[PDB]
């Protein structure tokens, strides 16, 4: 008598629902199937710019502003006779103005999940033209080559400024009076000091939400640079499935992963979840000591200037 008929008009319910979302995805799929081909079409033709070089130039932005470089825009510099002169975006405003932008995020128009070579060589758009104006007075998202960076940091005492912004418009800085990047041979080993910001000393102190060794092993100072195709992280395990930089993961100075990653994936809106991340990781543009764990910043950048 304990026969169960319900499972004749109980299943159709646990079934009907399965039909809905299943068909829901089937259409959702073929929807994405279109957006891609459209973008693929757009891509038949590239984007272009025309940035005429300012007459004034120097070893870097500092010398330039000292030389009269008043406005923030793309400038051409040359650290020495050896290095071929290269384009860079100078920020002549912010603190004092001798700001040589080493990294910049603002809209997610550039792929940061790139391999070793692109990072060492540098990639992205430095600046872009404005409406009607001939010169490129606006920066673009980019990454100056590691070499280009390494060379500069080692050229003399360099101070590093890191500015960021949330999706609520709020901004915070992170100042490091000392900054260095070794040659490729030393795997671009990073070293900073003299913190004096407002966002949180994520580089020397690790995440302010972790305890004991957990916190201590997320410090980036003294860490090596790593890309999804080059392991140099603090994760010494022999297990292949465990690396701090997975595919399409920003190259950064990892150590048992991180406390911050300004090169992480650009998640729109800031907050993002595990079921959204490619590998179920915190791969976005994070800065734990400030906006927390699963939160990608709206604006993030790294500039450089000689510390006197």
């Amino acid at each position: 008598l304990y026969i169960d008929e319900t499972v004749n008009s109980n299943i159709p319910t646990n079934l009907r629902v399965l039909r809905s979302i299943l068909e829901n995805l089937r259409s959702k799929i073929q929807k994405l199937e279109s957006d891609v081909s459209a973008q693929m079409e757009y891509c038949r033709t590239p984007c272009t710019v025309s940035c005429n070089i300012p007459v004034v130039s120097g070893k870097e932005c500092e010398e330039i502003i000292r030389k009269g470089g008043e406005t923030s825009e793309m400038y051409l510099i040359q650290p020495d006779s050896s290095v071929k002169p290269y384009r860079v975006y100078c920020d002549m405003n912010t603190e004092n103005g001798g700001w040589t932008v080493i990294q910049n995020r603002q809209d997610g128009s550039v792929d940061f999940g790139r391999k070793w070579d692109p990072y060492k060589q540098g990639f992205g758009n430095v600046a872009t033209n404005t409406d009607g104006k001939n010169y490129c007075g606006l920066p673009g998202e980019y990454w100056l080559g590691n070499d280009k960076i390494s060379q500069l940091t080692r050229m003399g005492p360099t101070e590093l400024l890191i500015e960021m912004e949330d999706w609520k418009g709020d901004k915070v800085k992170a100042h490091y009076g000392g900054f260095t990047v070794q040659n490729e041979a030393n795997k671009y080993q990073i070293s900073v000091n003299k913190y004096r910001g407002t966002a949180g000393n994520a580089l020397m102190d690790g995440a302010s939400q972790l305890m004991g060794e957990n916190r201590t092993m997320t410090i980036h100072n003294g860490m090596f640079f790593s890309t999804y195709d080059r392991d140099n992280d603090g994760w010494l395990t022999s297990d292949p499935r465990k690396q701090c930089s997975k595919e399409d993961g920003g190259g950064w100075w990892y150590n048992r992963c991180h406390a911050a990653n300004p090169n992480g994936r650009y998640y729109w809106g800031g907050q993002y979840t595990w079921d959204m991340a490619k590998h179920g990781t915190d791969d976005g543009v994070v800065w734990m000591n400030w906006k927390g764990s699963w939160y990608s910043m709206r604006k993030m950048s790294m500039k450089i200037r000689p510390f006197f």
Binding site: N52, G68, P85
Partner: protein
């Protein structure tokens, strides 16, 4: 006892099977879709192409470069003998194979010429591979070029009104001195030109001193923040520019860019003739549409 259920399960049996085939198909289509984005992602990997490019040819000056092979007038890196470092410039190369190192160009007034001493030394404005940009190379730069290898240099000045009509004026043995001597202008003489020798001064009509009071040969460069004029006051600050002023001028190319050309003492509170002028060719109240100052080793004469 009815058991009219075994007949309904088979209805569900097919229902299940249907869904399975959809789930399985979706999975496949998804696998395909992923192989497409990878193909797309490959596209969006290069930056936007900047139409501007520098030439690999390098020399002591635009002329030396031309000799090496340069055929197009664009942006190159020159580096004289006593130069600390190289630096970009706009070269002008003609059919006869001449390299004109240009140090001043006006054409739209997009660049404010009211710049300080430092701004005139290191140079200001923008460089275009097509000379459609306005700028000032930099006295120090100009110095290094003109004063190198102790070899003879010359200067050509091209003017253009608002009717496309143009003229030129050349000066042999052109040279600009070091900063220690305020980048003083100097030339042996006027090599002729349909525009006239405004540098030889110009007796306007106010005073009989106007001529030698408006000569520019031997005059040091001055700015509002570095007066060196032969004027009790500050010619540079008055006109609002940087130039080799005497008791001011007769040939003032860094003057205020006046649209349409013609202006007056009405277009100024105290009424100055602070425009891009050249007395021998046009009025003191007719500003040029286009201006261009370039040099070249004298021996490539007409």
């Amino acid at each position: 006892e009815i058991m009219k259920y075994e007949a309904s399960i088979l209805t569900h049996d097919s229902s299940i099977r249907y869904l399975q085939e959809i789930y399985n198909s979706n999975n496949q289509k998804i696998v395909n879709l992923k192989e497409k984005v990878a193909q797309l992602e490959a596209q969006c990997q290069e930056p936007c192409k900047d139409t501007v490019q520098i030439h690999d040819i390098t020399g002591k000056d635009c002329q030396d470069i031309a000799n090496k092979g340069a055929k197009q007038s664009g942006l190159y890196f020159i580096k004289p003998l006593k130069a600390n470092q190289q630096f970009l410039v706009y070269c002008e190369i003609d059919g006869s194979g001449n390299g004109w190192t240009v140090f001043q160009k006006r054409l739209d007034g997009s660049v404010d010429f009211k710049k300080n001493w430092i701004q005139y030394k290191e140079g200001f404005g923008h460089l275009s591979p097509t000379g459609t940009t306005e700028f000032w190379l930099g006295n120090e730069k100009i110095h290094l070029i003109s004063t190198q290898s102790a070899i003879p240099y010359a200067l050509r000045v091209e003017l253009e009104d608002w009717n496309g009509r143009t003229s030129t004026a050349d000066y042999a043995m052109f040279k600009v001195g070091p900063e220690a001597d305020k980048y003083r202008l100097t030339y042996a003489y006027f090599a002729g030109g349909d525009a006239g020798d405004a540098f030889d001064g110009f007796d306007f009509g106010d005073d009989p001193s106007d001529k030698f009071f408006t000569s520019h040969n031997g005059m040091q460069f001055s700015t509002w923040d570095n007066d060196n004029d032969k004027f009790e006051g500050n010619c540079a600050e008055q006109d609002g520019s940087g130039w080799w002023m005497n008791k001011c001028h007769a040939g003032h190319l860094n003057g205020v860019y006046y649209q349409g050309g013609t202006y007056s003492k009405a277009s100024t509170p105290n009424g100055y003739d602070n425009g891009i002028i050249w007395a021998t060719w046009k009025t003191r109240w007719y500003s040029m549409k286009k201006t261009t100052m370039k040099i070249i080793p004298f021996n490539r004469l007409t």
